[PDB]
Design a protein around this ligand. Structure first.
Ligand SMILES: *[C@@H]1O[C@H](CO)[C@@H](O[C@@H]2O[C@H](CO)[C@@H](O[C@@H]3O[C@H](CO)[C@@H](O)[C@H](O[C@H]4O[C@H](CO)[C@@H](O)[C@H](O)[C@@H]4O)[C@@H]3O)[C@H](O)[C@H]2NC(C)=O)[C@H](O)[C@H]1NC(C)=O
Ligand SMILES: *[C@@H]1O[C@H](CO)[C@@H](O[C@@H]2O[C@H](CO)[C@@H](O[C@@H]3O[C@H](CO)[C@@H](O)[C@H](O[C@H]4O[C@H](CO)[C@@H](O)[C@H](O)[C@@H]4O)[C@@H]3O)[C@H](O)[C@H]2NC(C)=O)[C@H](O)[C@H]1NC(C)=O
Ligand SMILES: *[C@@H]1O[C@H](CO)[C@@H](O[C@@H]2O[C@H](CO)[C@@H](O[C@@H]3O[C@H](CO)[C@@H](O)[C@H](O[C@H]4O[C@H](CO)[C@@H](O)[C@H](O)[C@@H]4O)[C@@H]3O)[C@H](O)[C@H]2NC(C)=O)[C@H](O)[C@H]1NC(C)=O
Ligand SMILES: *[C@@H]1O[C@H](CO)[C@@H](O)[C@H](O)[C@H]1NC(C)=O
Ligand SMILES: *[C@@H]1O[C@H](CO)[C@@H](O)[C@H](O)[C@H]1NC(C)=O
Ligand SMILES: *[C@@H]1O[C@H](CO)[C@@H](O)[C@H](O)[C@H]1NC(C)=O
Ligand SMILES: [Cl-]
Ligand SMILES: [Cl-]
Ligand SMILES: [Cl-]
Ligand SMILES: [Cl-]
Ligand SMILES: [Cl-]
Ligand SMILES: [Cl-]
Ligand SMILES: [Mg+2]
Ligand SMILES: [Mg+2]
Ligand SMILES: [Mg+2]
Ligand SMILES: [Mg+2]
Ligand SMILES: [Mg+2]
Ligand SMILES: [Mg+2]
Lengths: 139, 163, 139, 162, 139, 139, 139, 162, 163, 162, 139, 163
């Protein structure tokens, strides 16, 4: 059984605390298969290399008109997040819409976690669980 | 009643099973001696058509801070959203109903689907305010009041009469 | 003896009522020679052809988007204003500035008046009496 | 009948004259013995209100090629213009009515004062073309035609039954 | 006795031929006093210095992008127009409006003429005789 | 043998019917390995979890200036498509070019299909099979 | 006998020193009648009310972004310039053009002077003496 | 004391008069026997320099609603204006001081002439809110409180210790 | 003739095989006793250089509605595209050839690679039309015709003479 | 020789005078006995056509720092200007000639009236630099130099042979 | 052992030679597992199908304002690169930032290579190895 | 001293191991009879906190052409970057310090974090140059020099006196 997951945009995804996004893990298209979840984070139970990915749907009305969309690692060995894969976009360059997609292979040990952060989070526009999401699979 | 092909699991006979109607899903396929068991969709899920899903679709629709439920999650349909009062839909957003400036008046108030409609006040009428409800109103009519003209009005200011 | 005036922007020029701009008439660069003034209006006492003029300094931050700047006659012979010279401008196409100038010769009887209006008036930016003004001279 | 004050043309005596009604102007001021003489507006001219003008106002309004007369010049009012069929009014221009793309349908036709209104076609409905009239139509219902499902539909294409 | 005129926008002002704008000369606000007119041109009969002026109201939808608005002299002494006062403007930088005004004093002999041209003329927007016009007075 | 495919932009890709895009399945870079194809759709023959992906190259001249790019599931169990992974972009914010990329893990049974739709399809610019494409692999 | 002048753009008009624009006074359309000139300034010899005017043709490539165009009085009675009529403009909001016109009536004694300044002067575009100029006449 | 030349008002004789100092103007020119008479500026007027003006200059400067007087009208100078608290000067406007989003912190407060300055919060620090005052603060240090690490922090959230 | 290393499959001897020329690909590697078999590229495929591909490259190039084939798919090259008449290439698009307004004339007509070139009509010439072909034309010359000047011309209108 | 009508300066008699040719102007009108006197244009002035002007036109055209004279002031024509070397004419400005980036090459040099033309380097060719002169050049051909292939080239880099 | 790699942005990544980008292969997040590296290229040692991917972070100040971001194959069988997956973006449509992401499945033999090219390379903005990268894994 | 749980590898006893301090990482976990071995970070790597990493974090930060090291890579911190002289930080770029045009003067020079601050020269002062250092300077004061006024100054040109 190869570890895989795909977590979707949900009612509670945008905390406004400055912590990571949260995600649906069971309903609709969301699932967990050999990976776990805790407070927004994919929790790794089997060590190896994983392609991690995230999409966030951004949108707004006119124009910190630079958005950072990132995936970050947490390990209990070190008290600060480590950035893994990060995008900067200034999409407000009236109504606008933009999608930011990231993926890549990272090495993860058991007990490590991956989270998604968008700054400013207020520009994420949730609709149906198809336009913002976070997932991974072992490769 | 539409159908789907199955096979009896004891024998292997081909079966022709009933599909399940809107509001339900196939909880158990048909057998040689009983129909398909259609279960009701659980909370937060739906099926809108005749179907043979083994689970109902999730009511996945989320409404933003400027929206409200136009339809609730129900067994036969997903939730749907519309703009709250004071906003109208444009390009998947809910934008504020515009205000007609001075010199112009509302000819149709804003709706969930439509912005305020405005026109420039035609002759003999006015509007002094930037407003999202105020229409062009007729000038105070000095001759009708038997009073002398003091200051002629305009599209953006009422006529003034003496006493 | 040849009628002339130049009235300037003043801290009271923007009434916010939908009526005409008011103006300074005696201090600094403002003056009246053979013309009068009343609640914003130049008042004609010697009938004839006058070159009338106005300038208004507009400015703002981003973008309603269309501004009207005009000169209008009031006569007691008719119960609404008569348009004389008018401009439409869309300067907001994030600080911006734009100036609008109008001039033209019109016939004015004794007792008639000329006023200036701008819609939307909130875009007029007063500084010192040199950037918005209103004047005339007999020709 | 409203009135206006008039100092006699050359007698000097200071009078109270009848004004002239809409569609007329002061052809001759009032005198000692005679009331105001009001003439009808010449063609292409008007007066919308009671007045003591010595010339009617000119019907000065002009309609551009994308406009038609909402009202003609008349003795009591100026011409006025509106957008022709297929255009709507926006910031003093007549713009073309927009069309709703595939996946969306018309909920209100354009008018002289308003653009086409559109919506994404809700579940169970569709629109396959860019059009300024076509609405979201319900999917072909296979079960009600006693057919089986061939290709599921979408917001931009009809469901196919065998 | 002091020459003066103000000619206004009319339904015939935009000929589309590349020649000057035509104008209304008798109705509404238009008038001629000691000046004449012919096919668009103010025609001088009393030689002297004249303040000439024109305004044209421009507008459009989106963006050729450069507009010329000018006042030109015709004299029978020379077989082409002589530029007097000219403006270049790029207002189209999606409805927009912009007004262009010109004024200046020029010497004109008996028999010479002044005209107004705009390239591209299709951007002139007539409404009512108050937004585009052309005038002069002896100074 | 792990199911995989990558279908490329082709001559016939843009039907204009409002149905899905069609794709090259055999020539150049296109291939099918344990997945099938029918009328634009990847057809699944082995049930499991698949990372599906699509890129479309968009481009145009100035500015429904919002484009929807999506992947959708079809199952014979239900008469309507289900959206899986969707992006909204308004890239026309002169010539412009933009790419929209989507990927994610979804569960697919045998006999289900995945299609790609872009609304408005007319903004997809095909060149060589490298700039618009649709693929998947089992994870 | 009635004072008047029109001075035109010349190859020396833009000194780059921060001082006023200079102008042509005798050739082409330029002239002086009952007014004088000195280093850029119209010099008054007959005291009275004057309609003064200037136009400057601005242009550039892309976008400092705010331009000031003004008419200023110099009197020997006071050791700095007095602002009379001023405009602020932000035309650079990739070739662009914009023209700025000012006119107004001011009182001028014998011995006083009027000048034109633009900041930043580098945006003034000379072509032929018809697009930037400076003039006056007694009123 | 600087001087100016003045040809006598009607005697014709060509003189050398004392100028008037700041806060005054020439009320009466100098004559044969008498020196220049300098009067004080009326209210709402001024002269900032030595001068021979026959009227003081007018305090013509106007402050908009987002401005306050940096200096009042005085006999020796015009009013001047500055941006009110919470606004900074940019191209002749008073704009609102910007706030630093989550993940970034204020390194300099806004002033009348300058916007908020911000930086991304460097490693070991954080800011969780959009604010025009709040700085990047060091993460809670678990070891110095003798606690164990619960949740690592980030540039936009504090580290959690049990 | 360039080469690639191979191995005889019966024995294992190293071989030095011929590459294949433009228009062909390696259908069969060399053997101890025969050369490389170069096959011709099939339809819709090419090889432009000497090579040892085992299949030819696909003619993958697609031309849009505003373009046409500058070169066809051939055994030795891919297809290539250019703009049709009335269009020129800019930033990977085919845009409409501009029109010189009144007051200006074409000094170079548009091409597939170049937009219309325009200038303002110099003195003594004119152009009355927005046109993508019309050049500045000289004014009707009244003195040359022995006719009186009626109306002087300009950059955008011809001179008119009496008869 | 074209002519113009002239009512005698003070005799009153109504005449038919010879006009003056290009490069001249009417110094003295024609009279009873004498023909029109035509003088040559002073320096910095001109007349391009037959005329009866009493002053030549002024050579009023000015060239900016990015322009040079295409023609000088002459008795028969005004100065005219064109863009200097390295600039092309666009909407009355002289802009810098563009350069073709890596992967693209110059198909036509800039001129006074036209920008650099560029194309993507077709297959088998390349350009490695941003340049306003450099064309797409064919790849080094390994086989024709009797070398073996080291690194395949691209539209922006030359092919390497050992 | 399934082949995988993820190479990160580094000090030397932008050669300016017009050849491919170079990448960190050992430090931080970079790694190679059953794939090799030579002069910017992922070198394939085990033939099969690979999902290849790349992200580049673009950014600049105002506006060849079209960027090409591509993955290309090199084989010793043919003297020219073959394009695999290509994006065109014109993100300069003041400061701007944009990310371009590409992925897809391609077939690769032993001894073939994949490189990444961005034209114009000068718009890639390197920061920390998280915002531009190149990787792959066998599927 | 914070700790992490381990297990002796010979016996299985639970152990309570020391973490390693900033500048170091765990090179060898604790055993029943010796502490954790904290190794120093190698070149180009760091640890900023107490930790139990088995390798130090890489100094991954790269500075562009307009930047310079504000802090170097050190055992206890990553490298960090700031703008060089003549540039200031905005939105992750280093942009050129603006110049105050004529008519205006520097009231605060530019820094790594701040653009040039400018104002319009107040009355009695001037600045004739577009400059990134020049302040508004007071007008030459003719009365103070005992010289006659020649030409009054302005915000963009000094006053001129005779001699
Ligand atoms: C003050 O009050 C008086 C009433 O005591 C009021 O005077 C009225 O003015 C109106 C509007 O101008 C007049 O209405 C017109 O009358 C004639 C018939 O007498 C109609 O033919 C007019 O034309 C209409 O028909 C057109 C068809 O070609 C239509 O397109 C359009 O609907 C036209 O309006 C029109 O109805 C009316 O005669 C007077 N009444 C009296 C008794 O004088 C006046 O307007 C008021 N003043 C103000 C400032 O509001
Ligand atoms: C040339 O040199 C002379 C010196 O030989 C110089 O004259 C000076 O002018 C200044 C500025 O206008 C004068 O200063 C003022 O003096 C009075 C008192 O006499 C003060 O009340 C003034 O007001 C200040 O106070 C305000 C409080 O309400 C404050 O807001 C503000 O700080 C005000 O400035 C002010 O200080 C001074 O009197 C003269 N000195 C003499 C001896 O005449 C002149 O300005 C110079 N000329 C030029 C062109 O620079
Ligand atoms: C109508 O027709 C007549 C012909 O019957 C025509 O008159 C001609 O005008 C032209 C153009 O202005 C004249 O050409 C000039 O003549 C002199 C020599 O006589 C030349 O030196 C001139 O200068 C040229 O040389 C410059 C070198 O410094 C060059 O830069 C440039 O090429 C200059 O043009 C020039 O050739 C010509 O003399 C007359 N001919 C006669 C017989 O009068 C007139 O222009 C026509 N009218 C209209 C309105 O088109
Ligand atoms: C299709 O028709 C049937 C039978 O008349 C009905 O029960 C069903 O609800 C219909 N579906 C929809 C979407 O209306
Ligand atoms: C946390 O505190 C300890 C003990 O006082 C110290 O050695 C350490 O460096 C601190 N961490 C930081 C980031 O300052
Ligand atoms: C390289 O040279 C050879 C031998 O002269 C020739 O056959 C071949 O076609 C050449 N390649 C190209 C691309 O011109
Ligand atoms: Cl969503
Ligand atoms: Cl003001
Ligand atoms: Cl009009
Ligand atoms: Cl493609
Ligand atoms: Cl000029
Ligand atoms: Cl990076
Ligand atoms: Mg209103
Ligand atoms: Mg539709
Ligand atoms: Mg903050
Ligand atoms: Mg033309
Ligand atoms: Mg090149
Ligand atoms: Mg300066």
């Amino acid at each position: 059984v190869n570890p895989a997951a795909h977590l979707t945009g949900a009612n509670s995804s945008l905390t406004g605390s400055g912590g990571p996004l949260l995600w649906e893990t069971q309903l609709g298209l969301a699932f967990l298969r050999g990976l776990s979840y805790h407070d927004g984070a994919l929790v790794v139970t089997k060590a190896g290399y994983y392609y991690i990915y995230s999409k966030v749907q951004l949108g707004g009305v006119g124009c910190a008109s630079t958005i950072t969309h990132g995936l970050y690692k947490r390990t209990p060995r070190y008290p600060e997040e480590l950035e893994l894969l990060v995008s900067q976009q200034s999409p407000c360059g009236r109504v606008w819409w933009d999608s930011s997609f990231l993926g890549g292979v990272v090495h993860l040990e058991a007990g490590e976690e991956v989270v998604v952060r968008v700054l400013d989070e207020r520009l994420v526009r949730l609709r149906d669980g198809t336009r913002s999401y976070f997932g991974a699979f072992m490769v | 009643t539409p159908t789907y092909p199955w096979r009896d699991a004891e024998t292997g006979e081909r079966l022709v099973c009933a599909q399940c109607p809107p509001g339900t899903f196939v909880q158990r396929p048909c057998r040689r001696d009983s129909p398909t068991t259609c279960g009701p969709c659980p909370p937060r899920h739906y099926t809108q058509f005749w179907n043979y899903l083994e689970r109902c679709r999730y009511c996945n629709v989320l409404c933003g801070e400027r929206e409200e439920e136009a339809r609730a999650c129900h067994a036969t349909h997903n939730r749907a959203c519309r703009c709250r009062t004071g906003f109208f839909a444009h390009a998947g957003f809910c934008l504020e109903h515009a205000s007609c400036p001075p010199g112009a008046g509302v000819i149709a108030p804003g709706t969930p689907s439509q912005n305020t409609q405005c026109q420039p006040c035609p002759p003999g009428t006015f509007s002094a305010s930037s407003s999202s409800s105020e229409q062009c109103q007729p000038h105070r009519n000095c001759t009708a009041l038997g009073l002398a003209l003091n200051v002629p009005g305009s599209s953006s200011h009422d006529t003034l009469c003496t006493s």
